Amino acid sequence: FVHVHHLINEYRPHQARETLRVMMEVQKRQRLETAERFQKHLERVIEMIQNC
């Protein structure tokens, strides 16, 4: 029981830090993808505007 508690206490902080880093990376990737999509949409809008 003592060894199990020690292993749980040792594995909790590293797992939490890894999850936080993965969440930050996912948020950064989603923000970059949204920015690229908005840029492409604005380009298509300018193209459609200059079309007429």
Partner 1 sequence: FLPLVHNVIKCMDKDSPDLHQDLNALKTKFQELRKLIGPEQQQQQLHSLREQVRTKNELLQKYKSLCM
Cβ closest to partner 1, residue 8 vs residue 49: 49
Cβ closest to partner 1, residue 24 vs residue 45: 45
Q: How far is the CB of 46 from partner 1 (least distance, A)?
A: 5
Site size toward partner 1 (CB under 8 A) is: 6
Report which secondary-structure segment, H or E, holds 52. Answer: none
3-class DSSP state of 34: helix
Report which secondary-structure segment, H or E, holds 1. Answer: none
CA–CA gap between residue 40 and residue 45 (Å, rounded): 9
Residue ranges in contact with partner 1 by CB under 8 A: 42-43, 45-46, 49-50
